[PDB]
Amino acid sequence: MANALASATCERCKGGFAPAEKIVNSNGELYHEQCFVCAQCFQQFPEGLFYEFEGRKYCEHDFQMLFAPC
C-alpha cells in the first residue's frame, strides 16, 4: 500500500535497525541506542533514551536548563 517503503530506519540517522538493541521507539519516532539528539542543539546521547517527546526530542541539556526534576 502507499509508495514502496524501504525498511525500518532510524530518525536522526536512518540506520536500518530491527533488534530491540538497535531499534528504539519513543513518542512514535524510531531512535537507536545512541542517536537520541537534542531537537535544538542536536546533541546526541547514548542510553537510547533521554528527554524525548512527541514530534520533538531533547537531551538533558536544553531540558536541564528548563529545570524539570522528574
Could you tell me the three cell numbers for 46? 547514548
Q: State in angstroms the smallest separation of the CB of 2 from Zn ion.
A: 23
Indicate whether 33 belongs to the interface with Zn ion (CB under 5 A).
Answer: no
Indicate whether 23 belongs to the interface with Zn ion (CB under 5 A).
Answer: no
Environment class of 35 (CB within 10 Å of its CB; exposed 0-12, middle 13-18, buried 19+):
buried
Indicate whether 26 belongs to the interface with Zn ion (CB under 5 A).
Answer: no
DSSP class of residue 5 equals -
**Candidate residues 8, 20, 41, 68; the one interacting with Zn ion per rule CB under 5 A:** 41
Sign of CA dihedral 35, 46, 16, 30: negative
Indicate whether 37 belongs to the interface with Zn ion (CB under 5 A).
Answer: no
Q: Which residues bind Zn ion (CB under 5 A)?
A: 10, 13, 15, 32, 35, 38, 41, 43, 59, 61-62
